[PDB]
Amino acid sequence: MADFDDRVSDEEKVRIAAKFITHAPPGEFNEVFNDVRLLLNNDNLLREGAAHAFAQYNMDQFTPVKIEGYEDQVLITEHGDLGNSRFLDPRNKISFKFDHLRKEASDPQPEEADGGLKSWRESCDSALRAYVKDHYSNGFCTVYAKTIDGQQTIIACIESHQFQPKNFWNGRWRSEWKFTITPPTAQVVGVLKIQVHYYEDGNVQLVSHKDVQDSLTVSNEAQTAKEFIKIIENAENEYQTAISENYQTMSDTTFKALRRQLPVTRTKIDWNKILSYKIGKEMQNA
Amino acid sequence: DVSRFLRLYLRKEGYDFHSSSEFEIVKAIKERACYLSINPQKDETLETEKAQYYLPDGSTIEIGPSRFRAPELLFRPDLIGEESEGIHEVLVFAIQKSDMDLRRTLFSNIVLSGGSTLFKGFGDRLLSEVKKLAPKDVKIRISAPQERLYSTWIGGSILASLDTFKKMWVSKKEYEEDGARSIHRKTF
Amino acid sequence: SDQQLDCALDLMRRLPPQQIEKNLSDLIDLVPSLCEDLLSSVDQPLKIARDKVVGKDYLLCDYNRDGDSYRSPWSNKYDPPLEDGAMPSARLRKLEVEANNAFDQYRDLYFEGGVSSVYLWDLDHGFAGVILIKKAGDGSKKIKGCWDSIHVVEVQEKSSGRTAHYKLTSTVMLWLQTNKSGSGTMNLGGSLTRQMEKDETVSDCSPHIANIGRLVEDMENKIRSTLNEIYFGKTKDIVNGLRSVQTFADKSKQEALKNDLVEALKRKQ
């Protein structure tokens, strides 16, 4: 009789389900949710208990959402969170409700949060769109303006993904850049992350990130936005270049270091010779 | 590398060709009398007929088993001692890296080129190895043009004859202005 | 719950390969009825044990485990001690220790260190077994990695002709970390499983260990090449697909010249 009287509590089920859902690979989120739903077998508990796991995943991934009546999409991020499941669209100067399970926007309302940073944001947003279009085939960006501890900061989020489940792979790029303007200088904080999953007849997963730190001299809105984009361009180019170098490096160093293609002698092992030689070499090398 | 491997094996047989001029004779021996065995371990184990070759001066040398053991290097790079994939592995891997939709067409349309494929029975051995490495129930059709050696040049002549080629190349003046950049921009 | 078992296995494929031990424990606590199926089916990192009798580190498999106790292949003893006497023959102990010696030299040449354990059990047709190889990256060295490989072999010995049928199954699990200042902290994990079937000639000149030995290294070579070329290559292609260093505007210029050429080629027919 296998002891079935130690069943996992409702609080422990939510903690486990929330962990599996929030770490779901890009492009496999719904598949992870459906598997977790069957494992817990309690729809009310998972739906109410994991609501924060849906919000956390959608914001961490910069989930782009289409707003009815507008040409482009807006990124769902923590920087746009207005409370009550609503996010700010700083380009369209509205707030909207976002359904984290359906990923649908509704009830757009006028909202202006930029204040005295409107000119700073508009210069950065325009320069960034030109950058994203030149370097990302299907890239999206959203630029927020905030006052943080009395400091003027422009926050640029860039998202790009390629999901081809029919080809057995999914990949996502994320870049977040916070530019805090404290005249005569500005602090640059960047975080770059890439995740790729390829699972045709196997499983290989890449997770890589780099923190970037820089600084700029503050001028006018137009020159300051142009210098910020060039810093992003150089830092992301070096990051992608270094990943390409790591692929060549791993083949020659780390990958061969774990298992050599051949022994130091550059010969295949002669299994008949080893059986007799092992005895001969132990006494001859002593 | 096969010509160097043949010279090493002939020296073990007891025929020395130390001079750089004599190495050209070793290449001539390979080109004239060298076949790739369909089963390597079978012909390796079995005692081979001592096939005589006549040198430029008049002296006769017995080539024997070296005929088929030399060209095996292409499929077994460990013979020389190089940590690389076999020629048959390179072909199949190159197709498998391509997208699922094109893999079946790339296996269907295989084109042989280069001088080192001219070995007697090369196609028979390669076709057997591709089928073993390739996925199950895949059509493997390997086409060999009679003028393998001239394929690259003939293509160049065709491209050069086109009017589009006038836009494609980098002029002397364009090179002087931009520099090395001009070749990198316009080169495909 | 067959549907939960499928969902549990499908989830583990998508979860990080380093968190398999903790993630598997959580799924077992949710569905403890399928604990045996989940533990058996899901590939787990190889546990190491120290044998105080011989003074050798041996890798733990499912075959050597008799109840709770695990048999050490060097000592041929169960820890904790048992009086079951499940050793199939005395000839097996001679072949098993000789096999370990053969693959002990193998790992020292290719891997240079680590642990290898060969477990043989006799069957009515012919003996079977598992060969576990584990190699850990140096802690002091900037480079961090973990090699795991499980080679299950079943030999069907023919009555006459001495041409045994060798069935090999190989499951490799690879961890990689590159802490280069240029990149940051790169982590590239992977796992591959393959099977091979051959009919080698058995003799004093060509023994079982020699026939198996060639098949084991041949599978590792194919997996090593395929992973480094096919899977690690495709991974690089997707990363370059996400972002480009060159502007699309400059790319479309070269595409327009290439497209014009293609039209001029189809034109001249």
Swiss-Prot record, chain A:
This is F-actin-capping protein subunit alpha-1. The modification N-acetylalanine is found at residue 2. It comes from the Eukaryota. It comes from Homo sapiens. The lineage of its organism: Eukaryota, Metazoa, Chordata, Craniata, Vertebrata. The modification N6-acetyllysine is found at residues 19, 97. F-actin-capping proteins bind in a Ca(2+)-independent manner to the fast growing ends of actin filaments (barbed end) thereby blocking the exchange of subunits at these ends. Unlike other capping proteins (such as gelsolin and severin), these proteins do not sever actin filaments. May play a role in the formation of epithelial cell junctions. Forms, with CAPZB, the barbed end of the fast growing ends of actin filaments in the dynactin complex and stabilizes dynactin structure. It holds the Pfam family F-actin_cap_A. GO terms for molecular function: actin binding; actin filament binding; cadherin binding. PANTHER family: F-ACTIN-CAPPING PROTEIN SUBUNIT ALPHA, F-ACTIN-CAPPING PROTEIN SUBUNIT ALPHA-1. Keywords: Acetylation, Actin capping, Actin-binding, Cytoplasm, Cytoskeleton, Phosphoprotein. GO terms for cellular component: actin cytoskeleton; cortical cytoskeleton; cytoskeleton; cytosol; extracellular exosome; extracellular region; F-actin capping protein complex; WASH complex. InterPro entries: CapZ_alpha (IPR002189), CapZ_alpha/beta (IPR037282), CapZ_alpha/beta_2 (IPR042276), CapZ_alpha_1 (IPR042489), F-actin_cap_asu_CS (IPR017865). Component of the F-actin capping complex, composed of a heterodimer of an alpha and a beta subunit. Subunit of dynactin, a multiprotein complex part of a tripartite complex with dynein and a adapter, such as BICDL1, BICD2 or HOOK3. The dynactin complex is built around ACTR1A/ACTB filament and consists of an actin-related filament composed of a shoulder domain, a pointed end and a barbed end. Its length is defined by its flexible shoulder domain. The soulder is composed of 2 DCTN1 subunits, 4 DCTN2 and 2 DCTN3. One of its GO terms (biological process) is cell junction assembly. The gene is CAPZA1. The modification Phosphoserine is found at residue 9.
From Swiss-Prot, chain B:
It comes from the Eukaryota. One of its GO terms (molecular function) is ATP binding. One of its GO terms (cellular component) is dynactin complex. GO terms for biological process: vesicle-mediated transport. Its main location: cytoplasm. It is found in: Cytoplasm, Cytoskeleton; Cytoplasm, Cytoskeleton, Microtubule organizing center, Centrosome; Cytoplasm, Cell cortex. The keyword Acetylation applies. The keyword Transport does not apply. Keywords: Acetylation, ATP-binding, Cytoplasm, Cytoskeleton, Nucleotide-binding. Part of the ACTR1A/ACTB filament around which the dynactin complex is built. The dynactin multiprotein complex activates the molecular motor dynein for ultra-processive transport along microtubules. Belongs to the actin family. ARP1 subfamily. Part of the ACTR1A/ACTB filament around which the dynactin complex is built. The filament contains 8 copies of ACTR1A and 1 ACTB. Interacts with dynein and adapters such as BICD2. Interacts with BCCIP (isoform 2/alpha). This is Alpha-centractin. The lineage of its organism: Eukaryota, Metazoa, Chordata, Craniata, Vertebrata.
Curated annotation (Swiss-Prot), chain C:
The modification N-acetylserine is found at residue 1. Its main location: cytoplasm. InterPro entries: CapZ_alpha/beta, CapZ_alpha/beta_2, CAPZB, CAPZB_N, F-actin_capping_bsu_CS. Pfam families: F_actin_cap_B. The modification Phosphoserine is found at residue 1. One of its GO terms (cellular component) is brush border. Component of the F-actin capping complex, composed of a heterodimer of an alpha and a beta subunit. Subunit of dynactin, a multiprotein complex part of a tripartite complex with dynein and a adapter, such as BICDL1, BICD2 or HOOK3. The dynactin complex is built around ACTR1A/ACTB filament and consists of an actin-related filament composed of a shoulder domain, a pointed end and a barbed end. Its length is defined by its flexible shoulder domain. The soulder is composed of 2 DCTN1 subunits, 4 DCTN2 and 2 DCTN3. F-actin-capping proteins bind in a Ca(2+)-independent manner to the fast growing ends of actin filaments (barbed end) thereby blocking the exchange of subunits at these ends. Unlike other capping proteins (such as gelsolin and severin), these proteins do not sever actin filaments. Plays a role in the regulation of cell morphology and cytoskeletal organization. Forms, with CAPZB, the barbed end of the fast growing ends of actin filaments in the dynactin complex and stabilizes dynactin structure. Belongs to the F-actin-capping protein beta subunit family. This is F-actin-capping protein subunit beta. It comes from Homo sapiens (Human).
